[PDB]
Amino acid sequence: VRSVNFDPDAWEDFLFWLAADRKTARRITRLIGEIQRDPFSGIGKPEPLQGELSGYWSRRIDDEHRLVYRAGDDEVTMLKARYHY
């Protein structure tokens, strides 16, 4: 019922995983589903970020990679789905 939006970069992260490691892409897909259902609790250890990231949340895709998002009553928006070096 909550719609899913992507920032362009988050979308490219998703594309990247579809080709790079598809289980990671399935992880992300499961995470998104659970976020949509209720954005602030559940799997992947959701954390309310601080400081300049206040209002944003992260869930763990991997021990390394994080899905960072924002959520309202009508929509959830994905910001990133890959950790960069």
Partner: protein, 87 residues
């Protein structure tokens, strides 16, 4: 900022406090200063720092943040089409 001597006497309600208002308490001593925070707030802090500590990751993320704040770059996807693709 409180001295280590009072923090030791008052540790219990200082733990209730940091769990109530989510502000770190700074403690001073001769062995060095310490910060006391709630476990929840510490986890949120460590994750915030984790996202921001790699300069490349900080840049991409905060650029995403800036465009999200301008509210006109995001586009839609259904979770079914996502499950579709990841299959």
């Amino acid at each position: 900022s409180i001295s280590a001597s009072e923090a030791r006497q008052r540790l219990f309600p200082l733990i209730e406090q940091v769990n109530t208002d989510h502000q770190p308490v700074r403690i001073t001593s001769r062995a060095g200063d310490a910060v006391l925070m709630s476990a929840d707030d510490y986890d949120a802090w460590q994750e915030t720092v984790y996202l921001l500590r790699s300069p490349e990751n900080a840049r991409r993320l905060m650029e995403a943040v800036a465009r999200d704040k301008a509210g006109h770059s995001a586009f839609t996807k259904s979770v079914d089409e996502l499950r579709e693709m990841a299959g």
